Amino acid sequence: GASIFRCRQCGQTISRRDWLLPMGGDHEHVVFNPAGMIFRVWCFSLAQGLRLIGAPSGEFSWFKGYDWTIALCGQCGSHLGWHYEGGSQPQTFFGLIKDRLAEGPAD
Ligand SMILES: O=C1CC[C@H](N2C(=O)c3ccccc3C2=O)C(=O)N1
Ligand SMILES: [Zn+2]
């Protein structure tokens, strides 16, 4: 019942529990943006069904050495999180907003 993560707003398949990545020791990171919004961000090595938009940027990055791009649900356009790139071990990963995903079984 806990294996697949889907978009909460439309059901698009996004990631899997098996693809969780413990960045800095924890797959979960609680962070704030410049607009004062708090997010519980889950780190994943891999995700699918997103649409990555905009130019990568280092500004305000919560993960040192990475640049981010906005990750939208590719089906509904809900903002699900960010794609990180340009770093090391790993080079890239996804930080997705936990409350914007629904977790459940494969069937
Ligand atoms: O690592 C990240 C991802 C992007 C995220 N972020 C936002 O959520 C945001 C909203 C408004 C203006 C600027 C930002 C920005 O850098 C942020 O603050 N850090
Ligand atoms: Zn969606």
Author numbering: 18 to 124
What text comes from the article?
Ito et al. showed that cereblon associates with damaged DNA binding protein 1 (DDB1) to act as a substrate receptor for the DDB1/cullin4 E3 ubiquitin ligase complex. However, homologs of the latter, also termed the CULT domain, are further found in animals and bacteria as single-domain proteins, that have all essential residues of the thalidomide binding site conserved. Architecturally, the thalidomide binding domain is a member of the β-tent fold, which consists of two antiparallel beta sheets that are oriented at an approximately right angle and pinned together at the top via a structural zinc ion.
As we have so far not been able to crystallize MsCI4 in the absence of ligands, we tried the following prolonged soaking experiment: We soaked crystals of the original orthorhombic crystal form of MsCI4•thalidomide for many hours in the cryo-protectant solution in order to “wash out” thalidomide from the binding sites. Diffraction experiments were performed with crystals from two different crystallization conditions after 40 h of washing. Strikingly, the loss of the ligand was accompanied by the unfolding of a large portion of the protein around the binding site. In one of the structures, “Wash II”, three regions totaling to 37% of the previously structured part of the main chain were no longer traceable in the electron density. The second region starts in the middle of β5, comprises the first tryptophan of the aromatic cage, and ends at the cage’s second tryptophan at the start of β6, rendering its indole side chain disordered. The third and smallest region is the loop connecting β7 and β8. Therein we find a minimal invariant consensus structure that exactly coincides with the structured part of the “Wash II” structure: While the three flexible regions derived from the washing experiment are found in a multitude of conformations, the remainder of the protein is essentially invariant in all structures.
